[PDB]
Amino acid sequence: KNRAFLKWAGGKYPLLDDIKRHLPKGECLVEPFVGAGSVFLNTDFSRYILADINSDLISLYNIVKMRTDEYVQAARELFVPETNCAEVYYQFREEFNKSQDPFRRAVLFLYLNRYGYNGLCRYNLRGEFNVPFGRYKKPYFPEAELYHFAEKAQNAFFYCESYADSMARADDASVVYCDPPYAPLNSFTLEQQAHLAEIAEGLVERHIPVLISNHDTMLTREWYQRAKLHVVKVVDELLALYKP
Amino acid sequence: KNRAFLKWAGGKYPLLDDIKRHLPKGECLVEPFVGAGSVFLNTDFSRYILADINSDLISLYNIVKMRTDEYVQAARELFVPETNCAEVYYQFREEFNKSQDPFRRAVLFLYLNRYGYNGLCRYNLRGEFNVPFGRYKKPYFPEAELYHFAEKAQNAFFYCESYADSMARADDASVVYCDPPYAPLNSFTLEQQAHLAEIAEGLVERHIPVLISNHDTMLTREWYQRAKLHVVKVDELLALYKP
Amino acid sequence: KNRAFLKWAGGKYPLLDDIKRHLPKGECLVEPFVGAGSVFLNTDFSRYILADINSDLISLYNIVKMRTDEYVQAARELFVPETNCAEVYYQFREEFNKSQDPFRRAVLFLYLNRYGYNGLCRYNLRGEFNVPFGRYKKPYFPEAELYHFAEKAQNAFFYCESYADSMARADDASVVYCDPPYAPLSFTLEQQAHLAEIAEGLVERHIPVLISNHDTMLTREWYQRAKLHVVKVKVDELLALYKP
Numbered sequence A: 001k002n003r004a005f006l007k008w009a010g011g012k013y014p015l016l017d018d019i020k021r022h023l024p025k026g027e028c029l030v031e032p033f034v035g036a037g038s039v040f041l042n043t044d045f046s047r048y049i050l051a052d053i054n055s056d057l058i059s060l061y062n063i064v065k066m067r068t069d070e071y072v073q074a075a076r077e078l079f080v081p082e083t084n085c086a087e088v089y090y091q092f093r094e095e096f097n098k099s100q101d102p103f104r105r106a107v108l109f110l111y112l113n114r115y116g117y118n119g120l121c122r123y124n125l126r127g128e129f130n131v132p133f134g135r136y137k138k139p140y141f142p143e144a145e146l147y148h149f150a151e152k153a154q155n156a157f158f159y160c161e162s163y164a165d166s167m168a169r170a171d172d173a174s175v176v177y178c179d180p181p182y183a184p185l186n187s188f189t190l191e192q193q194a195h196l197a198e199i200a201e202g203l204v205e206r207h208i209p210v211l212i213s214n215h216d217t218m219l220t221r222e223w224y225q226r227a228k229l230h231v232v233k234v235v236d237e238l239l240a241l242y243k244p
Numbered sequence B: 001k002n003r004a005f006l007k008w009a010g011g012k013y014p015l016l017d018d019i020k021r022h023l024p025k026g027e028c029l030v031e032p033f034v035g036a037g038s039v040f041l042n043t044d045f046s047r048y049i050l051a052d053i054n055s056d057l058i059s060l061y062n063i064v065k066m067r068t069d070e071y072v073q074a075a076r077e078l079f080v081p082e083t084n085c086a087e088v089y090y091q092f093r094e095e096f097n098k099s100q101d102p103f104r105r106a107v108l109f110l111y112l113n114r115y116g117y118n119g120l121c122r123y124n125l126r127g128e129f130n131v132p133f134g135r136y137k138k139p140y141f142p143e144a145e146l147y148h149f150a151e152k153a154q155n156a157f158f159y160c161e162s163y164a165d166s167m168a169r170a171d172d173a174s175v176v177y178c179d180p181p182y183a184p185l186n187s188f189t190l191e192q193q194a195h196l197a198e199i200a201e202g203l204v205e206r207h208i209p210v211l212i213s214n215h216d217t218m219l220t221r222e223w224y225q226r227a228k229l230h231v232v233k234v235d236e237l238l239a240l241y242k243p
Numbered sequence C: 001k002n003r004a005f006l007k008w009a010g011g012k013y014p015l016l017d018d019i020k021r022h023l024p025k026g027e028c029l030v031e032p033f034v035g036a037g038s039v040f041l042n043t044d045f046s047r048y049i050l051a052d053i054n055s056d057l058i059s060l061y062n063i064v065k066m067r068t069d070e071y072v073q074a075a076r077e078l079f080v081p082e083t084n085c086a087e088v089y090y091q092f093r094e095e096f097n098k099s100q101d102p103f104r105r106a107v108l109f110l111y112l113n114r115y116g117y118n119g120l121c122r123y124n125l126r127g128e129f130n131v132p133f134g135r136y137k138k139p140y141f142p143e144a145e146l147y148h149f150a151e152k153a154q155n156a157f158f159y160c161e162s163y164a165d166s167m168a169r170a171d172d173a174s175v176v177y178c179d180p181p182y183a184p185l186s187f188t189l190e191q192q193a194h195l196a197e198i199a200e201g202l203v204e205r206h207i208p209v210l211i212s213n214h215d216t217m218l219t220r221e222w223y224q225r226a227k228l229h230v231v232k233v234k235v236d237e238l239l240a241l242y243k244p
């Protein structure tokens, strides 16, 4: 099983065999909530459309795609022992928030994902990255994963847009896999979670298959009430397949 | 231990022995929060006054009481294996939310109770029953529990009304048992919780016993401060107001 | 290992010996958040400034300090068996709340601390003490602890004031230890950060400060300028040292 190069919520990698079991076949996979990319990295579609609201994520993904060697080399420079302390961390963090250069931002952003508190990505109310120092003994530099993702990206487009716009991009030869922010047990709202179910109903009507993952709850069985449902044990996870 | 025909919060236990331990005796038992009826169903009062704000519940209970055979036969028809899929569950939910016939609604409510998600009874902001499909393997049809409920109901009146109104029907021959929506750890408010203790203080003074159960917390010991308290094992509390 | 005479939040002290391991040396210890006094009672500074916002607390401590004997004597009389029931608990609670005598208030207040639900100290919106009856088998009367506190109090001043005013009383010869109300898993986030800023200003002036809290994304954010130490205990506890 190939690993994502970012520490990122979801694609904590079980449920892969289960997603790949119910994931239908096609020329193209659309992921409106790509995140770490672990579905992308462990399937073999001939092409990919991959999207996410987080503009730092997509921008880094676009750099890894088009400037592979230059990127890896600059970013390796920051995984040295001299950088594993707070004095350097808060220094690199301040540079990230002050910079207008996407390439330097994207080198920094991988440093912050691996040297920061629980690998979180968060922002205060002014748009600044505000995750504090993570106090790790030995952060891994993910060389192999970086190369694997770049190779695999040669068959992908990355967009920074909302789930509605990227699902509109799908067509007759597409399959859609949605991994929205989890239902409860400004962020992603209930209106939006139900909205995501609607678009799917629209897509299957046109013979585009859609698969959605999420917790198993009263609200999730309500919203996906017209998919074929599949509970997977582990609290429980729910897979909803809209199969023409 | 006679089982209730409905699933209903709790469930499903009511620590009945501990309740019956402290529950005084009289001619008539008043429950302002009847719910599933565990206590009604497992005691021997000469008679009962039974009440709840949920009007779907009370209407059902009057129908089981007055039209037993008619009801059991119409409800049994929804328990056939042909109705055990999503397509049918959502249709029946819609039929129930659109019906204005009490009998038909009472018949569909049993189905929704037994085929819906975790046995919940919930409504959206438009008043529609909104529990989704439970996907159960093989729902039990509570035929014996139905008939026991009906037989026992012969000595019982049912009222859809709030706890202050049902509690005013008690007299010197009654006992009152209170199972309100739980204290914390249009829902039932803190002001209503305290209000219930105070209606209880005024009852016990008119020589009418009241027993209340709840979680054991800072707010419940404060509200029940003038009753004898017994802690049972989160912890349960039973506040007894004895003359 | 000397105990506090009050049951009180964080008076449960599974640290030390971690606080003392990390607490610097000096003539005077300032506590802005003394509470029940554990650090005070288990250290050997030549003098102390001890402060808290709760005025029932500070008034009590002034009384135990300055009227040790009449106090111990009057309090002892409430710790009998006829007082360990609700009819009496609520009677004394109403007395405390109605009273304007500080001496009798201080006497009722220890009764309420030991006979009351979970040793809580809480007021309602009218400012009346509102903890209910705690139903304990037999509450212990903290005689020896009272004298130990009184005797140690001879080297102490007590002020009823906010962390900002107490921390201003520290000088060259002082050390400051802050035990604030816990960060979340009423004291505000804005105050939580203000505290760390005053500490920063103290260390600039060569006055050490040690702070204690839960280990969280926020506490690491606020205390980002201290040397930090993590104590396993069950969520982790953080200690933050601002050393010259």
Ligand SMILES: CN(CC[C@H](N)C(=O)O)C[C@H]1O[C@@H](n2cnc3c(N)ncnc32)[C@H](O)[C@@H]1O
Residues within 6 Å of the ligand: A009, A010, A011, A032, A033, A034, A035, A051, A052, A053, A054, A161, A162, A163, A164, A179, A180, A181, A182, A188
């Ligand atoms: C992480 N993905 C979910 C994983 C997992 N189910 C969880 O909740 O932990 C969500 C991805 O959705 C992205 N996202 C959030 N809102 C939107 C949106 N409105 N449109 C597209 N992507 C979004 C987040 O950045 C995130 O990368």
Ligand SMILES: CN(CC[C@H](N)C(=O)O)C[C@H]1O[C@@H](n2cnc3c(N)ncnc32)[C@H](O)[C@@H]1O
Residues within 6 Å of the ligand: B008, B009, B010, B032, B033, B034, B035, B036, B051, B052, B053, B054, B161, B162, B163, B179, B180, B181, B182, B188
């Ligand atoms: C189920 N009973 C409580 C069981 C349990 N202690 C729990 O909290 O889950 C509560 C019952 O009280 C009813 N109820 C809620 N509010 C009122 C009210 N204001 N007056 C009368 N009954 C009420 C509910 O329909 C419910 O049937």
Ligand SMILES: CN(CC[C@H](N)C(=O)O)C[C@H]1O[C@@H](n2cnc3c(N)ncnc32)[C@H](O)[C@@H]1O
Residues within 6 Å of the ligand: C008, C009, C010, C032, C033, C034, C035, C036, C051, C052, C053, C054, C161, C162, C163, C164, C179, C180, C181, C182, C187
């Ligand atoms: C109990 N103390 C220690 C905290 C402990 N870590 C806990 O959260 O359980 C906090 C003390 O600080 C006091 N306190 C609350 N606010 C302030 C303030 N603004 N200034 C000084 N003391 C305060 C409380 O009365 C309390 O006694």
